[PDB]
Structure formats: structure tokens, C-alpha cells
């Protein structure tokens, strides 16, 4: 997340479209990936 913010700030004031697009994609990608990881982890460690 911190590196994503750094990238967004880098591309701000030069390619605002790219920065906005990557921020919008991250807002969905990060929570979904975290939830999938949590599901997999708990499933694989609560059934052994």
C-alpha cells in the first residue's frame, strides 16, 4: 500500500490519469486480495 501511494504521488502532476486509474484499481484489488488470503489461510490452518 505504501509503495502504491509512492507511485501515485510520483505520477501526480505528470500523468494524473495514470495515478487516478492505479488508485481506483488498488481500492478494489487490495481488500479483495487480503480477504482471499485470509480465507485460504484460515481454511488451511483450521482443518488440519
Amino acid at each position: 500500500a505504501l509503495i502504491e501511494f509512492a507511485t501515485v504521488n510520483y505520477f501526480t502532476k505528470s500523468q494524473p490519469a495514470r495515478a487516478a486509474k492505479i488508485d481506483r484499481l488498488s481500492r478494489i484489488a487490495f481488500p479483495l486480495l487480503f480477504g482471499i488470503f485470509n480465507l485460504v489461510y484460515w481454511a488451511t490452518y483450521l482443518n488440519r
Binding site: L2, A6, Y10
Partner: protein, 52 residues
């Protein structure tokens, strides 16, 4: 005399002290990608990193 030669395993220390400091140094380096017009952000990075 009965002697033992003990070699210390390092994995615990990699997990405990080496990786965190490496990551904190990377964090420190993140400061150089922030526009040098922002003072509060870069000083926040540096001071927080030092204290960590």
C-alpha cells in the same frame, strides 16, 4: 573434560531483527520518491524511521 561445539541457528534472528531493519531502511529510501516540496512528509519518514 567433556566438550561440546555449539553452532547457533540464525533463522530466529532473521525473523526477529534482521528483516525488520532491512524493511525499515527500504521505508527510509521511500522518502526520495516524494516531491522535495513537502517538508512534513519527508521529516515524518525520517524521524519515524530513526525512532523505529
Amino acid at each position: 573434560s567433556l566438550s561440546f561445539k555449539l553452532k547457533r541457528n540464525i533463522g530466529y534472528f532473521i525473523l526477529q531483527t534482521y528483516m525488520p531493519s532491512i524493511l525499515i531502511t527500504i521505508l527510509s529510501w521511500v522518502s526520495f520518491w516524494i516531491n522535495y516540496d513537502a517538508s512534513a512528509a519527508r521529516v515524518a519518514l525520517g524521524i519515524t524511521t530513526v525512532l523505529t
